[PDB]
Design a protein around this ligand. Structure first.
Ligand SMILES: *C(=O)/C=C/c1ccc(O)c(Br)c1
Length: 127
């Protein structure tokens, strides 16, 4: 096996992904980003890089909302993220279109608080 057998949207996804280093995150079928509470990128997997074109190694440390993903700097994406950061229970799923310096690509996004401190998952798959 060369993949992690975890489905997008699984109810306990934050528990299953707590064990995963960067290599294991690259075994997921869906894009996975981990952000801090300000939106800085802590982790970013291969599937996400294939969806978006960004280089998973280069995006670490950039700010998702200010730097790499201005199309998500909106109430419908960033607004939802920061509300869930504030409440401590982020868990929201919605479709969205990624269109900054790329062919517009419609995705399903699932944001969910991670078990580690100051850490929040953004999961992405195509629709
Ligand atoms: C809109 O600006 C979306 C940009 C975007 C979406 C998803 C990822 O992973 C990146 Br780095 C940028």
């Amino acid at each position: 096996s060369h993949m992690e057998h975890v489905a997008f949207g699984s109810e306990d996804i934050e528990n299953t992904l707590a064990k995963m280093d960067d290599g294991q995150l690259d075994g997921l079928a869906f894009g996975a980003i981990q952000l801090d509470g300000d939106g800085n990128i802590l982790q970013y997997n291969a599937a996400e890089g294939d969806i978006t074109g960004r280089d998973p190694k280069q995006v670490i440390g950039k700010n998702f909302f200010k730097d790499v993903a201005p199309c998500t700097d909106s109430p419908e994406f960033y607004g939802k993220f920061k509300e869930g950061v504030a409440s401590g229970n982020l868990n929201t799923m919605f479709e969205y279109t990624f269109d900054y310096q790329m062919t517009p690509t419609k995705v399903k996004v699932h944001m969910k608080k991670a078990l580690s401190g100051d850490s929040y998952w953004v999961f992405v798959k195509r629709v």
